[PDB]
């Protein structure tokens, strides 16, 4: 349907242990394709996807040039920030960055993203209009004011629309097998007593792609979100995904409950009943 | 320097069949900072050949790692996942249930 | 295809 490609960069200082550590990973949708690591011995962009291993070495070279360029950018980004906020070098601080782009079912551009976060909170980030910056605190205004005056927002918008998209366009051909497939969940219920007057009802979804999904419990058709347990969606590690939600019920009123699953690989959503 | 206690999930790849070669996944998410130690146990003793996925995060800037190893459970063998993190006064241990 | 900022912009 719609599609996405994002690049995620984590850098971390280790004050005693030398240089900061830089980790970056490619993703199309919920499929990962490449990775790069400051501490790896390869020092190249390595493929994480079978359909991306086919690219020429002049592809790999140029990509690993640009990621290496980012890495030192962020290492100096970490120095600037310790300076800006006046934290002591003894502390270990973290700088996360993401950028990428979204396309419609025909493949035209939809949205685009360029953003950084310092110590798990937002530092700077590009607005949806792609003409301005949102800057949380008085530090990021300085970087805003650097990047406004230096015309950064113009140059990234040209990347995001021109480049970011065209690659996602080829990747989705290249990976037609995996990338564009969609997998319905295999679903079922399990029943796990606790006391003699109570039982636990768990509704499962297994082996689905993409990972966006909605699990729902109800009684008599009325919605039960109150007493419901629901776990975070977990990668099955084969490339598919897994999730479950569960409720506690008075025994024996169980068939009075319905579990409702919605996923993009489902022509019509389902209903499970015990 | 905000802090986030990790969410730990331990599970088989495919629903278990005793004497069938599954994988064992321990999946941690939603945590901050990113330094995290994770082990996979058989009966309480750590497993050596363990690979992990590559460090990433979700839109809320919370990290997620997947630690995985191939295995073949028995009716006897107990398995579990040990995670230590800055947010945990001791390492927390999670025993793998065939129903979770 | 990764961001190439030409000449790179730090803070």
Coordinates of C-alpha atoms in Angstrom, one line a residue:
Chain A
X1 CA 0.0 0.0 0.0
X2 CA 1.9 3.0 1.4
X3 CA 5.6 2.4 2.0
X4 CA 8.5 3.9 4.1
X5 CA 12.2 4.0 4.3
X6 CA 14.1 5.3 7.4
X7 CA 17.7 5.6 8.5
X8 CA 18.4 5.5 12.3
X9 CA 21.6 6.8 13.8
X10 CA 22.6 6.3 17.4
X11 CA 25.8 7.7 18.7
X12 CA 27.0 7.5 22.3
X13 CA 30.1 8.9 24.0
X14 CA 32.2 6.7 26.3
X15 CA 34.4 9.2 28.1
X16 CA 37.1 6.9 29.4
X17 CA 36.9 4.4 26.6
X18 CA 37.9 6.7 23.7
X19 CA 35.8 7.9 20.7
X20 CA 32.0 7.8 20.7
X21 CA 30.2 4.7 19.2
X22 CA 28.1 5.2 16.1
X23 CA 25.4 2.7 15.0
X24 CA 23.2 3.2 12.0
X25 CA 20.6 0.9 10.3
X26 CA 18.5 1.0 7.1
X27 CA 14.8 0.0 7.0
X28 CA 12.2 -0.3 4.3
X29 CA 8.8 -0.5 6.1
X30 CA 9.5 -3.0 9.0
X31 CA 12.1 -4.9 6.8
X32 CA 15.8 -4.1 7.7
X33 CA 18.3 -4.0 4.8
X34 CA 21.6 -2.5 5.7
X35 CA 23.7 -1.7 8.8
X36 CA 26.9 0.3 9.8
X37 CA 29.0 0.2 13.0
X38 CA 31.9 2.4 14.3
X39 CA 33.4 -0.5 16.1
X40 CA 33.0 -3.2 13.4
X41 CA 36.2 -4.3 11.7
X42 CA 34.7 -4.2 8.3
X43 CA 34.3 -0.4 8.3
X44 CA 31.9 -0.8 5.3
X45 CA 28.1 -0.6 5.0
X46 CA 27.1 -4.2 5.3
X47 CA 23.9 -5.6 3.8
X48 CA 21.2 -7.0 6.1
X49 CA 18.8 -8.0 3.3
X50 CA 19.1 -10.8 0.6
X51 CA 17.6 -8.6 -2.1
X52 CA 20.1 -5.8 -1.4
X53 CA 23.2 -8.0 -1.7
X54 CA 22.9 -7.6 -5.5
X55 CA 24.1 -4.0 -5.7
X56 CA 27.4 -3.0 -7.3
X57 CA 30.5 -2.0 -5.3
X58 CA 30.3 1.6 -6.5
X59 CA 27.0 1.6 -4.8
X60 CA 28.5 0.2 -1.5
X61 CA 31.5 2.6 -1.7
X62 CA 29.4 5.8 -2.1
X63 CA 27.0 4.8 0.6
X64 CA 29.7 4.0 3.1
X65 CA 31.3 7.3 2.2
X66 CA 28.1 9.2 3.2
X67 CA 27.4 7.3 6.4
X68 CA 31.0 7.8 7.6
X69 CA 30.5 11.5 6.8
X70 CA 27.4 11.4 9.1
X71 CA 29.3 9.5 11.9
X72 CA 31.9 12.2 12.4
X73 CA 29.2 14.9 11.9
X74 CA 27.4 13.4 14.9
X75 CA 30.6 12.9 16.9
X76 CA 31.3 16.6 16.6
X77 CA 27.6 17.1 17.1
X78 CA 28.1 15.5 20.6
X79 CA 31.0 17.8 21.4
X80 CA 29.0 20.9 20.4
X81 CA 26.2 19.8 22.6
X82 CA 28.2 19.1 25.7
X83 CA 29.6 22.6 25.1
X84 CA 26.2 24.1 24.4
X85 CA 24.5 22.7 27.5
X86 CA 27.7 22.7 29.6
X87 CA 27.6 19.1 30.8
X88 CA 30.9 17.6 32.1
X89 CA 32.8 15.3 29.7
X90 CA 32.8 12.6 32.3
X91 CA 29.2 11.9 31.6
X92 CA 28.1 9.6 28.7
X93 CA 25.5 11.2 26.5
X94 CA 23.5 10.0 23.5
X95 CA 22.5 11.5 20.1
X96 CA 19.9 9.8 18.0
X97 CA 19.0 10.8 14.5
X98 CA 16.4 9.7 11.9
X99 CA 15.6 10.7 8.4
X100 CA 13.6 9.2 5.6
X101 CA 10.5 9.3 3.4
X102 CA 7.1 7.9 2.7
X103 CA 5.3 7.2 -0.6
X104 CA 1.8 6.4 -1.7
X105 CA 0.4 3.3 -3.4
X106 CA 1.4 4.6 -6.8
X107 CA 4.7 5.7 -5.3
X108 CA 4.5 9.5 -5.2
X109 CA 6.1 11.3 -2.3
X110 CA 3.9 11.5 0.8
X111 CA 5.8 12.8 3.9
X112 CA 9.5 13.2 4.9
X113 CA 11.4 13.3 8.1
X114 CA 14.7 14.6 9.3
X115 CA 15.2 14.8 13.1
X116 CA 17.7 14.4 16.0
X117 CA 17.1 13.6 19.7
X118 CA 19.6 14.3 22.6
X119 CA 19.4 11.9 25.6
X120 CA 16.0 10.4 24.6
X121 CA 14.3 13.8 24.2
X122 CA 13.8 15.8 21.0
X123 CA 16.6 18.3 20.2
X124 CA 15.9 19.5 16.7
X125 CA 13.7 18.3 13.9
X126 CA 12.3 19.3 10.5
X127 CA 8.7 20.4 10.2
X128 CA 6.2 18.6 8.0
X129 CA 6.0 21.6 5.6
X130 CA 9.7 20.9 5.0
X131 CA 10.5 24.6 5.1
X132 CA 11.2 25.1 8.9
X133 CA 12.6 23.7 12.0
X134 CA 11.1 22.8 15.3
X135 CA 13.6 23.5 18.1
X136 CA 12.7 22.6 21.7
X137 CA 15.1 24.6 23.8
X138 CA 17.5 27.5 23.6
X139 CA 20.3 25.3 22.4
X140 CA 18.5 24.1 19.3
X141 CA 17.5 27.7 18.4
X142 CA 21.3 28.2 17.9
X143 CA 21.5 25.2 15.6
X144 CA 18.2 26.3 14.0
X145 CA 19.8 29.8 13.5
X146 CA 22.9 28.0 12.2
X147 CA 20.9 25.8 9.8
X148 CA 18.3 28.5 8.8
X149 CA 21.0 30.9 7.9
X150 CA 23.0 28.1 6.2
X151 CA 20.0 26.9 4.1
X152 CA 20.0 23.4 5.4
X153 CA 16.2 22.8 5.2
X154 CA 16.4 23.5 1.4
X155 CA 19.1 21.0 0.8
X156 CA 17.6 18.1 2.8
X157 CA 14.1 18.6 1.1
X158 CA 15.9 18.1 -2.2
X159 CA 17.4 14.9 -0.9
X160 CA 14.2 13.7 0.7
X161 CA 12.0 14.2 -2.4
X162 CA 14.6 13.5 -5.1
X163 CA 17.0 10.9 -3.7
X164 CA 15.3 9.3 -0.7
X165 CA 12.3 8.5 -2.9
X166 CA 14.0 7.2 -6.0
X167 CA 16.0 4.7 -3.9
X168 CA 12.9 3.4 -2.1
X169 CA 11.4 3.2 -5.6
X170 CA 14.2 0.8 -6.8
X171 CA 14.4 -1.1 -3.5
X172 CA 10.7 -2.0 -3.7
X173 CA 11.2 -3.4 -7.2
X174 CA 14.5 -5.1 -6.1
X175 CA 12.7 -6.7 -3.1
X176 CA 9.4 -7.4 -4.8
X177 CA 9.5 -10.9 -3.3
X178 CA 9.8 -9.8 0.3
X179 CA 9.2 -6.1 0.5
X180 CA 5.7 -5.9 -1.2
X181 CA 4.3 -9.2 0.2
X182 CA 1.8 -9.0 3.0
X183 CA 1.2 -11.9 5.4
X184 CA -2.1 -12.6 7.3
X185 CA -1.7 -13.5 10.9
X186 CA -2.3 -17.0 12.0
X187 CA -4.7 -16.5 15.0
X188 CA -6.2 -18.6 17.9
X189 CA -7.1 -18.5 21.5
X190 CA -5.5 -20.1 24.6
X191 CA -7.1 -20.5 28.0
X192 CA -5.1 -20.5 31.3
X193 CA -6.9 -20.8 34.6
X194 CA -5.7 -19.1 37.7
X195 CA -8.2 -19.8 40.5
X196 CA -11.3 -22.0 40.4
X197 CA -13.5 -18.9 39.8
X198 CA -11.2 -17.2 37.2
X199 CA -9.4 -17.8 33.9
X200 CA -7.1 -15.9 31.5
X201 CA -8.1 -15.6 27.8
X202 CA -5.2 -14.8 25.4
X203 CA -5.7 -14.0 21.8
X204 CA -2.7 -14.6 19.5
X205 CA -1.5 -13.2 16.1
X206 CA 1.5 -15.0 14.7
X207 CA 3.6 -14.6 11.6
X208 CA 2.3 -11.4 10.1
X209 CA 3.9 -8.7 8.0
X210 CA 3.8 -5.6 8.2
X211 CA 3.8 -5.2 12.0
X212 CA 1.1 -2.5 12.2
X213 CA -1.9 -4.3 13.8
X214 CA -4.8 -3.8 16.1
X215 CA -5.9 -6.3 18.8
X216 CA -9.3 -5.9 20.5
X217 CA -11.3 -7.6 23.3
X218 CA -15.0 -7.2 23.8
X219 CA -17.9 -8.5 25.9
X220 CA -21.4 -8.8 24.3
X221 CA -20.0 -6.6 21.5
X222 CA -19.1 -3.9 24.0
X223 CA -15.5 -2.9 24.2
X224 CA -13.4 -4.1 27.2
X225 CA -10.2 -2.0 27.2
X226 CA -10.4 -1.7 31.0
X227 CA -9.3 -5.2 32.2
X228 CA -7.1 -5.9 29.1
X229 CA -3.5 -6.8 29.0
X230 CA -1.8 -6.1 25.7
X231 CA 1.9 -6.8 24.8
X232 CA 4.2 -4.8 22.6
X233 CA 4.5 -6.2 19.0
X234 CA 7.5 -8.6 19.0
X235 CA 9.6 -9.5 15.9
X236 CA 9.5 -13.3 15.3
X237 CA 13.0 -12.9 13.8
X238 CA 12.2 -14.7 10.6
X239 CA 11.0 -11.4 9.3
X240 CA 7.4 -11.8 10.5
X241 CA 5.8 -10.5 13.7
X242 CA 3.8 -11.6 16.7
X243 CA 1.5 -10.0 19.2
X244 CA -1.2 -11.0 21.8
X245 CA -3.7 -9.4 24.1
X246 CA -5.4 -11.1 27.0
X247 CA -8.2 -10.5 29.5
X248 CA -9.3 -12.0 32.8
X249 CA -12.9 -13.3 32.9
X250 CA -15.2 -14.8 35.5
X251 CA -15.5 -18.5 34.7
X252 CA -17.5 -19.7 33.0
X253 CA -18.5 -16.6 31.0
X254 CA -16.0 -16.9 28.1
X255 CA -17.9 -17.4 24.9
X256 CA -19.5 -14.1 26.0
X257 CA -16.1 -12.5 24.9
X258 CA -14.9 -11.8 21.3
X259 CA -11.4 -11.1 20.2
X260 CA -11.1 -8.8 17.2
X261 CA -8.0 -8.7 14.9
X262 CA -7.4 -6.1 12.1
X263 CA -4.5 -6.4 9.7
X264 CA -3.7 -5.2 6.2
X265 CA -3.4 -8.8 4.9
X266 CA -7.0 -9.4 5.9
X267 CA -9.7 -8.9 3.3
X268 CA -12.1 -8.4 6.2
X269 CA -11.0 -8.4 9.8
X270 CA -11.7 -11.4 12.0
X271 CA -13.5 -12.4 15.2
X272 CA -12.4 -15.2 17.5
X273 CA -14.7 -16.7 20.1
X274 CA -14.1 -19.6 22.5
Chain B
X1 CA 19.4 12.4 30.4
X2 CA 16.0 10.7 30.6
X3 CA 15.7 7.0 31.7
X4 CA 13.5 4.2 30.5
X5 CA 13.1 0.7 32.1
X6 CA 13.1 -2.0 29.3
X7 CA 10.2 -4.1 28.3
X8 CA 11.4 -7.8 28.1
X9 CA 9.6 -10.5 26.1
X10 CA 10.9 -14.1 25.9
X11 CA 9.4 -16.5 23.4
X12 CA 9.9 -19.2 20.8
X13 CA 10.0 -18.1 17.1
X14 CA 7.4 -20.8 16.2
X15 CA 5.1 -22.2 19.0
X16 CA 7.1 -24.9 20.7
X17 CA 7.3 -28.6 19.8
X18 CA 9.6 -30.6 22.1
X19 CA 12.3 -32.1 20.0
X20 CA 11.8 -29.7 17.1
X21 CA 14.3 -27.1 16.3
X22 CA 12.8 -23.7 17.1
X23 CA 14.6 -20.5 17.8
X24 CA 14.7 -18.7 21.1
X25 CA 14.1 -14.9 21.1
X26 CA 14.5 -12.5 24.0
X27 CA 13.2 -9.2 22.8
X28 CA 13.7 -6.0 24.9
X29 CA 12.3 -2.6 24.0
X30 CA 11.3 0.8 25.2
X31 CA 14.4 1.6 27.2
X32 CA 16.9 4.4 27.6
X33 CA 19.9 4.6 27.7
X34 CA 21.1 2.1 25.1
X35 CA 23.7 0.2 27.0
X36 CA 22.0 -3.0 27.9
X37 CA 23.3 -6.5 28.9
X38 CA 21.2 -9.5 27.9
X39 CA 21.8 -13.2 28.4
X40 CA 19.9 -16.4 27.4
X41 CA 20.0 -19.3 29.9
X42 CA 19.5 -23.0 29.8
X43 CA 18.5 -24.3 33.3
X44 CA 20.3 -21.2 34.7
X45 CA 23.5 -21.4 32.8
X46 CA 24.3 -18.8 30.1
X47 CA 24.3 -19.7 26.3
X48 CA 27.4 -18.9 24.4
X49 CA 26.5 -18.7 20.7
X50 CA 24.0 -15.8 20.8
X51 CA 23.6 -13.2 18.2
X52 CA 21.7 -10.0 18.4
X53 CA 19.9 -7.8 16.0
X54 CA 21.2 -4.4 15.2
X55 CA 20.6 -1.4 17.5
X56 CA 17.5 0.6 16.5
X57 CA 14.7 2.6 18.0
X58 CA 11.0 3.4 17.6
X59 CA 9.4 6.8 16.9
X60 CA 9.4 7.6 20.6
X61 CA 13.2 7.3 20.6
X62 CA 13.1 4.1 22.7
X63 CA 15.5 1.4 21.8
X64 CA 14.8 -2.2 20.8
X65 CA 17.1 -5.2 20.5
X66 CA 16.3 -8.8 19.6
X67 CA 18.6 -11.5 21.1
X68 CA 18.1 -14.9 19.4
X69 CA 19.5 -18.4 19.4
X70 CA 18.5 -21.7 17.7
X71 CA 17.5 -24.5 20.1
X72 CA 15.4 -27.6 20.7
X73 CA 13.4 -27.6 24.0
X74 CA 12.7 -30.6 26.0
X75 CA 10.0 -31.3 28.6
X76 CA 12.7 -30.9 31.2
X77 CA 14.9 -28.0 30.0
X78 CA 14.1 -24.7 31.7
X79 CA 15.1 -21.6 29.7
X80 CA 15.0 -17.9 30.7
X81 CA 16.3 -14.4 29.7
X82 CA 18.5 -12.2 32.0
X83 CA 18.5 -8.4 31.4
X84 CA 20.5 -5.8 33.3
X85 CA 20.2 -2.1 32.7
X86 CA 20.8 1.1 34.5
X87 CA 17.2 1.2 35.6
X88 CA 17.3 -2.2 37.5
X89 CA 18.5 -2.5 41.1
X90 CA 19.4 -6.1 40.2
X91 CA 19.3 -8.1 36.9
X92 CA 15.8 -9.2 36.2
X93 CA 15.2 -12.8 35.1
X94 CA 12.4 -13.9 32.8
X95 CA 11.5 -17.6 32.5
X96 CA 10.3 -18.6 29.1
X97 CA 6.7 -20.0 29.1
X98 CA 5.5 -22.2 26.3
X99 CA 2.3 -20.1 26.5
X100 CA 3.9 -16.7 26.1
Chain C
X1 CA 20.5 5.8 -0.6
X2 CA 21.9 7.8 2.4
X3 CA 21.8 11.5 3.1
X4 CA 24.7 13.3 1.3
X5 CA 24.8 16.8 2.7
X6 CA 27.5 17.9 0.2
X7 CA 29.4 20.0 2.8
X8 CA 28.1 18.7 6.1
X9 CA 26.4 20.9 8.8
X10 CA 27.1 20.3 12.4
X11 CA 25.4 22.3 15.1

